């Protein structure tokens, strides 16, 4: 297991968080739940070297 | 079952009495504990009358059959606490406590609570969740109640114990968790706050 | 002189086994006192659990009798509590206590500091934040690890700020709210943003609150 990060660049929400997952696809599902749970809907981009997601 | 009042209020300098009732009291002995907040309970009265070594002389007890009474002659601000009576149960085998009495002491001017009822946020509702927020602030022990239309709700309720604010006044909060279907299936929702026999209500409805 | 100290895990997943140990300093377990355990659920009264003598004699609360076990141990001079099949009702502050017992009476004179155990099946989780649109504030809804910190417009706005204590819901997640009272005229000009930090999940978000 490894730890991934996300950057949030939404209208009223802006910040970062982490979770732990085995693949990036499972992490993508976890961050998608978080963003939806807080109302954020945007465009997703990924960087594998930093293991960081970011939605805008 | 040991019965004592939920709250007793005083002002500095006078005599304060807390009464604990129970059937098994005469054939047994009662005991009194004081609990400062966030601390372990402290025994303050032994064998229905005896004062332990270390408690101020102003702490006396009395017994009148099925009644024990803790008396504080000349109360001070260092005694605002919670007080628990204790005895044996109906079977004389296990120790039993009472409900507990929140003894308030300081007499800064009595404050009427201010209440604000908040609707569920739009962001929360798109996540298939509903949570009503009742906020009580600037009062000087409080009870809270929820009503759907004209019926009491006793499910999905969370209450927080009062906490002192920056301005020395107390404040408390309550939450009502619902599915969004229950939020739209009722005409309104009401928060009912009872403070020293004075009750203030707030109401919300879906937009 | 004679002191009591609790120890043990402060977290047990549901259906697990709560295990606590009270250590005795400045005195021997071999006294004629009964070593008991009492608990206080947050905001509730006191609840006796059971007692033990230095010989191993036991006496348990009947409503919990099936799933309790109090053992003594003179080699390390402590006595233990083991509560199995734990539910959410067992989230409480646990006090070991010394019990003076006569032929007809029993009472507690010496108490330990007390330790809190929280029965939750949960995982470090970034808190979801929702705006309470106006008095105004933010709602922090679902985070398991306890310490969460709330500031308002950085460390600038500190007049009339109240952050309420956290509450443990049915799901095992914590929730709290932080409110501020502001003038009903400063709505148009001032832009308000609430800052929430959760050190364990490593979350740091800012939410802007605007009446709709």
UniProtKB/Swiss-Prot annotation, chain A:
Compartment(s) where it occurs, according to its Swiss-Prot or TrEMBL record: Secreted, Cell wall
Highest taxon in the source lineage: Bacteria
Protein name: Immunoglobulin G-binding protein G
Coverage span on the entire protein: 441 to 496 of 593
């Amino acid at each position: 297991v490894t730890t991934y990060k996300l950057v949030i660049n939404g209208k009223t929400l802006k910040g970062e968080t982490t979770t732990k997952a085995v693949d990036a696809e499972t992490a993508e599902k976890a961050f998608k739940q978080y963003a939806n749970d807080n109302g954020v809907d945007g465009v997703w981009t990924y960087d594998d070297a930093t293991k960081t997601f970011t939605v805008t | 079952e040991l019965t004592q009042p939920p709250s007793v209020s005083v002002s500095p300098g006078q005599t304060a009495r807390i009464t604990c009732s129970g059937d098994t009291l005469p054939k047994r002995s009662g005991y009194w504990y004081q609990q400062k907040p966030d601390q372990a309970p402290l025994l303050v009265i032994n064998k229905d009358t005896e004062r332990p070594s270390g408690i101020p002389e102003r702490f006396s007890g009395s017994k009148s059959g099925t009644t024990v009474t803790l008396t504080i002659s000349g109360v001070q601000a260092e005694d605002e606490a919670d007080y628990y009576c204790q005895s044996a149960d109906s079977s004389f085998t296990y120790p039993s406590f009472g409900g507990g009495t929140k003894l308030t002491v300081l007499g800064q001017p009595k404050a009427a609570p201010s209440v604000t009822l908040f609707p569920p946020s739009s962001e929360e509702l798109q996540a298939n969740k509903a949570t009503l927020v009742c906020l009580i602030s600037d009062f000087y022990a409080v009870t809270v109640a929820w009503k759907a239309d004209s019926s009491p709700v006793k499910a999905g309720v969370e209450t927080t114990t009062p906490s002192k604010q920056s301005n020395n006044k107390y404040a408390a909060s309550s939450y009502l968790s619902l599915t969004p279907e229950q939020w739209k299936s009722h005409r309104s929702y009401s928060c009912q706050v009872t403070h020293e026999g004075s009750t203030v209500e707030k109401t919300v409805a879906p937009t | 002189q004679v002191q009591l100290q609790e120890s043990g895990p402060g977290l047990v997943k549901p259906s697990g086994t709560l295990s606590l140990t009270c250590t005795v300093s400045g005195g021997f377990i071999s006294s004629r006192n009964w070593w008991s355990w009492v608990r206080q659920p947050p905001g509730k009264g006191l609840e006796w659990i059971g007692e033990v003598y230095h010989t191993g004699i036991t006496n348990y609360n009947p409503s919990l009798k099936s799933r309790v076990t109090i053992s003594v141990d003179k080699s390390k001079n402590q006595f233990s509590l083991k509560l199995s099949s734990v539910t959410a009702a067992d989230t409480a502050v646990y006090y070991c206590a010394r019990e003076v017992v006569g032929p007809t009476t029993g009472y507690f004179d010496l108490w330990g500091r007390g330790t809190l155990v929280t029965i939750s099946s949960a995982s470090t989780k970034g808190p979801s934040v929702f705006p309470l649109a106006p008095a105004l504030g933010c709602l922090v809804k679902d985070y398991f690890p306890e310490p969460v910190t709330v500031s308002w417009n950085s460390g600038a706005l500190t007049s009339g700020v109240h952050t309420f204590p956290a509450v443990l819901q049915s799901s095992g997640l914590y929730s709290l709210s932080s409110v501020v009272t502001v003038p009903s005229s400063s709505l148009g000009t001032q832009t308000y943003i609430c800052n929430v930090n959760h050190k364990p999940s490593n979350t740091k978000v800012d939410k802007k609150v605007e009446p709709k």
